[PDB]
């Protein structure tokens, strides 16, 4: 776990390799979990068919992970501004686009871009403003 | 031996792995009846003569037997060869050894030492299970009443379901 | 005859248990100094 966290430790826009690798893993992990629920429920017809679906979901998710990581890191590199929700949005923007392609739908890319990017941007803001998620009870 | 309990514990896991591969309804009943025998033995190891025998008396022949009974009446359609299951089961027999092995090298360990009967009065009586179970009638008489209602309303629950 | 007899088995137990009461001191004394002789003697084998 010390791993994933590393993504945040190094300043954004720097060491994109690590960023892309980490982001790709998270997506892939989600892919596995997502495929699992998708196979446990709404099962397949043959073991192979399901192994394929696991692969499909895993790769698609890994891809959205990569492009998000790559775009955000590079956008920051090229733009030279490390702290900017916009970097992430461009990244989320891209991530959605990959999802759209994998699903072969321009429309999905639309919602995907907006919704996904917005979400990622909010993550950046969240980190920048020190928003706390799942907080301990401090009442 | 000193590994009097471990070995047994290992057999208990084997029987549970057999029930877990969900073998034919009655072939596995045997499996339970086996690990119930095994669990009966371990408790005896620690001095729980009563508590132990109790299991051999109620879950073994009372609950389990009734279970298979019903299997015969239904769900013993006896339409995967359990032998395939035995094949897998054999895999687990040693696959569990793998799980233990990692911690085996990691090592408590070296069988089982004084990891049983931690403290026993080298003098004295009345120290024996069944004195504790008989607290149902002195100082723990609420567990006794609620168990009653379980069995008592059990009658009424079963018939109502059956009807 | 089961009234009058099982009463006696009680009175024999009291006779038999009070014997045990008189010898807790000797045993508990031996048991203290014995186990208190094991682990100085094991403290040594660990330390000596």
């Amino acid at each position: 776990k010390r791993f994933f966290e590393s993504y945040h430790e190094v300043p954004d826009g720097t060491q994109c390799h690590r960023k892309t690798y980490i982001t790709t893993a998270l997506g892939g992990i989600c892919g596995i979990i997502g495929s699992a629920y998708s196979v446990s429920l709404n099962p397949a017809d043959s073991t192979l068919e399901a192994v394929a679906r696991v692969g499909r979901y895993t790769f698609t998710a890994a891809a959205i992970g990569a492009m998000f990581g790559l775009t955000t890191c590079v956008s920051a590199q090229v733009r030279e501004k490390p702290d900017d929700p916009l970097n992430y949005f461009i990244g989320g923007c891209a991530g959605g686009l990959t999802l759209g392609a994998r699903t072969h739908s321009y429309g999905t890319a639309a919602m995907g871009c907006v919704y996904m990017g917005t979400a990622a941007a909010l993550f950046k803001i969240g980190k920048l403003e020190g928003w706390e998620l799942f907080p301990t009870p401090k009442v | 031996m000193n590994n009097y309990i471990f070995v047994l514990s290992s057999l208990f896991l084997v029987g549970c792995l057999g029930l877990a591969l969900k073998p034919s309804p009655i072939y596995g009943g045997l499996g339970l009846i086996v690990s119930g025998f095994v669990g009966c033995l371990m408790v005896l190891g620690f001095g729980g003569s009563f508590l132990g025998l109790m299991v051999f008396l109620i879950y073994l022949g009372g609950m389990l037997v009734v279970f298979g009974y019903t299997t015969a009446m239904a769900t013993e359609e006896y339409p995967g060869s359990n032998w395939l299951i035995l094949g897998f089961l054999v895999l687990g027999v040693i696959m569990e050894v793998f799980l233990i092995c990692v911690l085996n090298y990691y090592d408590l360990g070296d069988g089982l030492g004084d990891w049983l009967m931690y403290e026993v009065d080298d003098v004295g009586v009345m120290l024996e299970g069944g004195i504790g179970v008989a607290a149902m009638y002195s100082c723990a008489t609420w567990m006794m009443v609620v168990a009653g209602w379980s069995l008592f309303a059990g009658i009424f629950i079963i018939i109502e379901i059956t009807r | 005859r089961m009234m009058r007899w099982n009463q006696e088995r009680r009175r024999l137990l009291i006779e038999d248990l009070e014997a045990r009461i008189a010898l807790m001191p000797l045993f508990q004394a031996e048991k203290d100094r014995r186990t208190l002789q094991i682990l100085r003697e094991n403290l040594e084998e660990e330390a000596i």
């Binding site: - | 009586v125 | 009463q7 009680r10 009175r11 009291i14 248990l17 009070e18 045990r20 009461i21 807790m24």
Partner: protein, 80 residues
Amino acid sequence: ISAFLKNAWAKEPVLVVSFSVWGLAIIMPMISPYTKYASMINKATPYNYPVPVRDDGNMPDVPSHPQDPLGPSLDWLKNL
């Protein structure tokens, strides 16, 4: 009611006994001269050791010695 018991004693002569001894055993303890002793004969048994209390001189009853006239003397359990 009293002559209904007469066929239930001729035919069905089992449940009669089972509801005549089920109960008899609930009234024998409440009405017997000797039921007091069961919680007393069972209270005298010294299974564990009687720990002696330190003397202060403020305790007259506590029998100093096992053979003092004082203390729980059961000349009852004997010839109960």
